[PDB]
């Protein structure tokens, strides 16, 4: 409230192992999306 | 012949010393109590809190709208201003 009071509404419990198979995605069967922009300065997570 | 910080970012007691918090809260950080047999053993019999960094809440020694000015001049102060 007000950035002058806060309430923990509750708590998220996440556990997690390193490795992979499990990636974020920005959206939702085969065939790798590459979208790529040549010359441009582009952040880039290749 | 009968508290210790443990992880928490503060220590007891020394909390009334003007530290300031965004929020806290108590429950029955790891803030362990032991008893001790003449230092010779030690038996754990724990408090936890958890906190929000930033001012709101301040920690004081001892206890509606003015405000003291405590000042001592001329002389090695431990001032907190």
Do not use: E, H
């Amino acid at each position: 409230w007000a950035y002058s009071k806060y309430y923990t509404i509750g708590t998220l419990y996440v556990s997690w192992s390193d490795g992979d198979g499990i990636t974020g995605v920005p959206q939702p069967g085969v065939s790798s999306f590459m979208n790529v922009t040549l010359d441009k300065c582009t952040k880039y997570n290749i | 012949r009968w508290i210790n910080t443990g992880n928490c970012p503060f220590s007891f007691g020394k909390v009334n010393n003007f530290v300031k918090f965004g929020s806290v809260c108590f429950s029955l950080c790891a803030m362990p109590i032991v008893a001790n047999w003449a230092y010779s053993k030690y038996y754990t019999i724990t408090l936890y809190v958890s906190w929000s960094d930033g001012d709101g809440i301040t920690g004081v020694p001892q206890p509606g709208v003015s405000s003291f000015m405590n000042v001592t001049l001329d002389k090695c102060t431990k001032y907190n201003i």
